[PDB]
Amino acid sequence: GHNDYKYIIHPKNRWYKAWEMFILVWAIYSSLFTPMEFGFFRGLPERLFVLDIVGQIAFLVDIVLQFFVAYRDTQTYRTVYKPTRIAFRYLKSHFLMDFIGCFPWDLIYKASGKHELVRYLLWIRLFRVRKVVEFFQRLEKDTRINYLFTRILKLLFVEVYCTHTAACIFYYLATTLPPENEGYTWIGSLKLGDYSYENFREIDLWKRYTTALYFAIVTMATVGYGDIHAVNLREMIFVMIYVSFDMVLGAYLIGNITALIVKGSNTERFRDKMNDLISFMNRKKLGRDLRSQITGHVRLQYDSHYTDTVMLQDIPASIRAKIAQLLYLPYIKKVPLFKGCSTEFINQIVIRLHEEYFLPGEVITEQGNVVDHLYFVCEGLLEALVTKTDGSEESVTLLGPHTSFGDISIICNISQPFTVRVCELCHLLRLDKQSFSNILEIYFHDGRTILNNIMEEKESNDRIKKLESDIVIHIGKQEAELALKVNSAAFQGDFYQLKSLIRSGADPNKTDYDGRSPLHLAACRGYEDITLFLIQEGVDVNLKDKFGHTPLFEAVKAGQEGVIGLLVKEGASFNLEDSGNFLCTTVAKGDSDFLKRLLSSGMNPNSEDYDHRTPLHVAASEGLFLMAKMLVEAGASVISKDRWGNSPLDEARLCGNKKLIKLLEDVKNAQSS
Amino acid sequence: KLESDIVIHIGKQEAELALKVNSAAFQGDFYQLKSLIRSGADPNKTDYDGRSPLHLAACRGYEDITLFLIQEGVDVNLKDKFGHTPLFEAVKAGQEGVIGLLVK
Amino acid sequence: GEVITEQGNVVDHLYFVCEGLLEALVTKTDGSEESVTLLGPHTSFGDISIICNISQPFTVRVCELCHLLRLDKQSFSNILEIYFHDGRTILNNIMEEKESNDRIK
């Protein structure tokens, strides 16, 4: 709608197309009549005045209409609607010839005392054949008609044109000589049969024109009967020039027709291959069913045109992906192998897919052979069988539309457990082994989180009992690195990054090298929000790292009452080995708050050691009355006997803190009760 | 306006390079560590768990990695956030070859 | 001045050197590709990567006009698997080199 001007008309407008065809008809005529007007008349016979004036005006109108038609640029490929650019383009290329040939050159010739050199400018109207050339340019750029066939008709029109012009020039050369020397011309000395072309300027223009055209036509085919022949030196020279250029034009005609016939139709090439195969097939005397198999598969390769699918490898990746998506993606989405995976990975797979058709009864993949081509059964039923060593087929599965096979062997790098053979017209989508693996490895991430899901699919088959493979190890490496990333986020405080990482498909229950979950890190650095975020995810709250440190242990050692509260509400527990030992060590340190936090978490304070002493034992021996109060509130036994029977009551007397002993005796009556 | 990812991956130029060195050490891929350590960053920087490439390499017991880490000269007595030296990780795993390398 | 195998791409084609001189350059993030060795006539490269199923240790670049004989990875693996004895001999031959590669362990 950028044609704001009310003057410029788009070059593809229907009315302008009709006008283009119409000036074409007049271009052919004004280009085919100009040689006749130049040769057979030294001034039009008045009776043609009307036709001459109407022709001149017809082109004159066109000359103007060429200022009101937009032209597509050769550098921006847009229809330039600026009137000054159209006017400049027309003035520069096709304007001198058009305007000069639009002049009434017949009237100008008559006005200037009938001077011949003025009439020689009639040939400027020969430039009007540029319209015919442009028409052939349009016709060539259309699949509706074969190119070499366009070239043949172009060459034939050129041949007809050159023949007609040569006839007109030949008769004009006859007219250059004065009528007194008629016997020395080519037509003035013509005695064909009983007719004698004595006064050749008085015969009807059609008789003379057909004589000249007969000569030109036979000269063009080099028949040269000899009845009509050059006599003058001017006629000799013209016939020599015409004859040489006619040898070039006819040789080009033969070359173009030969090029069309040796081009080779696609059906022709298929027919040659078919004939060779049939001759082979007669030599080997193959049976009718077997010959039908061979012929049918060759026909299938012919119709499928697999290279036509790779024929658009030149078009951009954007549109290439659009075509692959519009054709294979609906099929691929439904395959159970890629159930529940990212759309990006699916799109990558589709782009790398090559469709192949197979007639019933041909093995696709052979058992005992490592599959290097994963197939997506998309149309037609396939049948999978493990043929026994005794030659007994055992159909194990029937893979209909929207199914996949070969994937086990590629992901496993194992051999194909069952030979797969076709049962109907199976339109499949082959994907190469290196292609698939790449989409996971070479296309890292595209083949990390997504492939993990694919591994979930394979394990959900419930028959696959695979251990590990190159693909799987590569993935596990990537998932390890991703786990490092998400754990770094969970230990750095970057909430947005952690969100993005796990929401990109990362499993929140993964661990790093030393088995530390992101929840471990959130608790250790006391990241309340991150902890709660991972808490929502479902990360294990008593997850055990390399040293058994639970997330709630890390939270307690970090002194994050918010995080420990959250973890106990979810249910994190002190499943720590040597619990009594660590508690007694804490008592020895004197870290009152640390022990209080462990005791609040629910650490059992009655756990013994190698010396078989509870934390309360150590507190009583140490004289730590306040740690003893905390242990008492927890419920550590003050009567528990150690190796030597030294109960915490005894150790307290040994230390001599009478207040400590008194509180422990109140506890001892509590225990005895 | 989801900016500042610059400083995120600078905190990971200190870390993610260090965690990649740690990961290669834990996996056992000597060639990778050699390239990363010389072309990327020294193994003196530890991970978020305060674990030096040497610590994890010592635990795994790949002397190849350790001897290269020894060439870089990372602290052989450095403790982790868990208060544990590479020597202890080595003996915990019982990697007498890497134990001898570390004792040297 | 051409590259056959690039460092870190698993070699799928094992090459021999009939005539010419090659060079094992370790490309890096410094650009100073480390000249590990010069592969002269009657040598081979890509063998470590194929046999050991690792990536290429060093990019092999052409220095002269080199006539190289090629053996695809799948082919080579097939002949090795067929002649288990002979592949064992190959493995010893490369083990002597693996004193610095440590791939065998």
UniProtKB/Swiss-Prot annotation, chain A:
Family membership noted in the UniProt record: Belongs to the potassium channel family. Plant (TC 1.A.1.4) subfamily.
Organism whose genome encodes this protein: Arabidopsis thaliana
Topology relative to the membrane: Multi-pass membrane protein
Residues spanning the membrane: 21-41, 49-69, 93-113, 120-140, 155-175, 237-257
ANK repeats: 479-510, 514-543, 547-576, 578-607, 611-640, 644-673
Binding-site residues for a nucleoside 3',5'-cyclic phosphate, renumbered to this chain: 337-459
Record-given protein name: Potassium channel GORK
Gene that specifies this protein: GORK
GO cellular component, one term: monoatomic ion channel complex
Biological process, per Gene Ontology: monoatomic ion transport; response to abscisic acid; response to calcium ion; response to cold; response to jasmonic acid; response to water deprivation
Intramembrane segments: 211-230
Residues of the full protein shown: 50 to 722 of 820
Tissue: Expressed in guard cell-containing tissues, in root epidermal cells and in root hairs. Detected in vascular cells of the root and shoot.
Domain of life: Eukaryota
Keywords linked to the UniProt accession: ANK repeat, Ion channel, Ion transport, Membrane, Potassium, Potassium channel, Potassium transport, Repeat, Transmembrane, Transmembrane helix, Transport, Voltage-gated channel
Subunit structure and binding partners: The potassium channel is probably composed of a homo- or heterotetrameric complex of pore-forming subunits.
Domain notes: The segment S4 is probably the voltage-sensor and is characterized by a series of positively charged amino acids. The pore-forming region H5 is enclosed by the transmembrane segments S5 and S6 in the Shaker-type (1P/6TM) and contains the GYGD signature motif which seems to be involved in potassium selectivity. The KHA domain (rich in hydrophobic and acidic residues) present in the C-terminal part is likely to be important for tetramerization.
Sequence ranges on the Extracellular membrane side: 42-48, 114-119, 176-210, 231-236
